Design a protein around this ligand. Structure first.
Ligand SMILES: *C1=CC(=O)N(CCNC(=O)c2cccc(O)c2O)C1=O
Ligand SMILES: *C1=CC(=O)N(CCNC(=O)c2cccc(O)c2O)C1=O
Ligand SMILES: *C1=CC(=O)N(CCNC(=O)c2cccc(O)c2O)C1=O
Ligand SMILES: *C1=CC(=O)N(CCNC(=O)c2cccc(O)c2O)C1=O
Ligand SMILES: *C1=CC(=O)N(CCNC(=O)c2cccc(O)c2O)C1=O
Ligand SMILES: *C1=CC(=O)N(CCNC(=O)c2cccc(O)c2O)C1=O
Lengths: 174, 174, 174, 174, 174, 174
């Protein structure tokens, strides 16, 4: 703004910019996961699709946060997007564990920003997160956990066979 | 879980299990109310329908709570369902008063769990209740109060005639 | 009633109330089974769906029994619903065995009530059970037995893999 | 009520009546703005439409607040509606500045009532405001600010020409 | 204007502004009536709907008057809207009597303005009122009188029963 | 691969990874441009849309490059995405100049990679670029140049008025 800004603290404004960076980094990590599973020597198309769709979801979250920054009169500021933590992601099990770790770290950042906004008596911020992010993250984390249990069930013995079956029979593919 | 659980206190987990029990008990009480009004010596079909639909609503609430328990990584635990407080429910007026008492007790339990979750800095829980339960209860309680006033208006004099008219002209029936 | 009651013994009236309780307890047991399989550390969606649909079927049976109680002029009386026998249900095999045990106990109660009604020369009761319950139970018990054999075939060796395949390829899921 | 009222403080009840008055006063101010721009010596049809639609929006907000007062068992009490602050509203720029001032004052009243309700542990009130008012106000204030910037851009030089172009090319008209 | 004003006296211009105020005050009185009948301790939905629709009709009349003020080149001037005469409105009979009193006072103001305009040889004003207001008021007053007679017929004896029947069987409701 | 890789040099593989980084950096720069023009103190919706659509186009280019990396048996490797060169982007003219600079730098990188691939006798790479990138860049650069000329024509005198008109009459908006 400063023509529209009202009840929007500098602390929240900066934390929103940080959360945009976290969501875009998550979207980048998922881009990397997706194309790893499209390698000809990995070749699990369902897994690739699963992570490519999450890359899109996380970019959308970032964009909603940026829209909101501007609705409140804050200034979007971008930082570098750190490269993902790995160049190769292992098995579907390794990948799904890394994804759940990533999601829990995003969820904690959401929770932290909600607490700041509730502290700052910023109910628009708090409801924004409640309405568009918190349940999306709980639903995604539950789906990931369900996947992890199924993958684990499958790859106790006959790990190859189990990885193929999960990709074929649980994950969406052509 | 414990693979997905995050920011979900044992206190909230137990209170959610208790609230499931309260909703299922309410659904049972409404089952009983419904079939009481289907007796050939009571025979108020609109009233029966009204309570049978509330039995379904309260079971749905319980099921949403149980879904949520699992989304958060808590463990659903069931207790006995206590039989309803009465075997015979009197007149439509008596029944509607009992229903409003029941609803207010469910609403207070919701309010209590919201307070616990807000105390515990559990905004997913608080929003879950706000989004799916609190306004449903306020709307139902208002409808019940509107009914009670109409029933009372009718059964001051000519109590039989008034009970019949309310069932015929206010409540949904075939 | 007592304006409509005809050829409807106190013994049958009480046994019908007991059978309503048994069906509602079975529906509760299936609720518990269903949500157990929705746990993130169990995560067998087909199995959850299978038991949640049986919860609905058993509640419907109870409701038909209650309708019938009132059609005959008897008085519905509700008792407590005892909590299910277990809080955690083990593997799909354990669960399906428990379900078959439960069904056989409901079937025996049906058979017992049919015998009482035939003894009491109550052909409406006997036909009611024949028409709406006995073949439903035989068909369900046969489906359960078919499932049990398939589960057993699968989990002799590679128990995880087999549990996943059964849920994926036999049970209805999204 | 007092048959339905639960967890609804006298402080909130009175503040809701005050907020109804503020919304209806805002709707009146917008009525005046609208018809000012319909004057033959002002004659900016888009601007008239813009303010007449806001008059309707603010009346709708008041009506939702009054519905809610009754849902909670409070008593609606009306006060006079003070005449708008001006009889003539100047240029589109003057008018849009006055509108943003008005909106910010409504938003602050919303924020104030949210704080009271959160203080009073009234989560239905707080969610009611979050769900139906706070983001509507943030979205409207942002649209007004976007308009103000465009109007300002236009009327630096050639103020007549710029006022006409904004009305023609930004605002909805026939 | 003063570019368009022709044959439009200052006396008529001021009386039109006064009549706008009277119509908006009537619309406010009807808002209050409407929400009174939506109270849970009043609870006559047809009556609420009846008065809420009249609130809309009276606002529309005010808006047509304001449009006309501007068509003729007069200047709309707004005054405060006085709060309604009562905070609680009694029975349907009391309310309908108050409404007929209100309508007759609006009708007299219309008649008075018609006389002024005919005196001033302002046939556009006179026809405007004839075409859009006078018969609308006569039709509404007749409907109110028909209602009053029916309410009176009903609440001679068994006043509660009669109030319920009128709302149910005469007034439009869901 | 290395099961599928054929005629695909390490030099091309690395240059493709670099070009992915350049396209994703361009997409990030356009994200920033887009949200700058959505600021309430900038407020040029057409310009925002124009840059947000380019953010999507550049991400799509990166994704096609990554698909191709894997089709050829190379290994995608991601680096950090450097933050954009500016935090605030000035006027539409400044922004469009920065965009043309950015595009020309991407085009040169395409040309450079084409030369490498033609040097390496890698006709699949060369045709891939010819078919999916080179004419897309020439068409975009021409559109940008057409825009720049129009913006310049407009903001010689009356820079505000001209910026508004270009956004309104050239760029796609709601
Ligand atoms: C330090 C600031 C402060 O007041 N405090 C509380 C903020 N509130 C919450 O974290 C919270 C969480 C969930 C629901 C609520 O309604 C709620 O207030 C701090 O953290
Ligand atoms: C004891 C725990 C605590 O902090 N305290 C406050 C919890 N907050 C609320 O009850 C409440 C109610 C409605 C809206 C809110 O935003 C809100 O924080 C306790 O009860
Ligand atoms: C004790 C009461 C009595 O008479 N006796 C027989 C009831 N009949 C049956 O059990 C039966 C079962 C299946 C078909 C029939 O037609 C039928 O009579 C007792 O159990
Ligand atoms: C004085 C009453 C009180 O407890 N205190 C806090 C009320 N809470 C908030 O204002 C608030 C704002 C935004 C989100 C929340 O969750 C929240 O509790 C007072 O103002
Ligand atoms: C004082 C002004 C004047 O001339 N006089 C008459 C106005 N005319 C009427 O009141 C009237 C009413 C109905 C139909 C007509 O055609 C008509 O002229 C005054 O009141
Ligand atoms: C150094 C490698 C080499 O041979 N040399 C030529 C590559 N060819 C081209 O750059 C080119 C450009 C456009 C169309 C062609 O058909 C074509 O060969 C080097 O740069």
């Amino acid at each position: 703004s400063s023509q529209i800004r009202q009840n929007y603290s500098t602390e929240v404004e900066a934390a929103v910019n940080r959360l945009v960076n976290l969501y875009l980094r998550a979207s980048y990590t998922y881009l990397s996961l997706g194309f790893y599973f499209d390698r000809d020597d990995v070749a699990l198309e369902g897994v690739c699709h699963f992570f490519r769709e999450l890359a899109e979801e996380k970019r959308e979250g970032a964009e909603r946060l940026l829209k909101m920054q501007n609705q409140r009169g804050g200034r979007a500021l971008f930082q570098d997007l750190q490269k993902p933590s790995q160049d190769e992601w292992g098995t579907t099990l390794d990948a799904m564990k890394a994804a759940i770790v990533l999601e829990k770290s995003l969820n904690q950042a959401l929770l932290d920003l909600h607490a700041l906004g509730s502290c700052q008596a910023d109910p628009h911020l708090a409801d924004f997160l409640e309405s568009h992010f918190l349940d999306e993250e709980v639903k995604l984390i539950k789906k990931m956990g369900d996947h992890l249990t199924n993958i684990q069930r499958l790859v106790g013995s006959q790990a190859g066979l189990g990885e193929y079956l999960f990709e074929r029979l649980t994950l969406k593919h052509d």
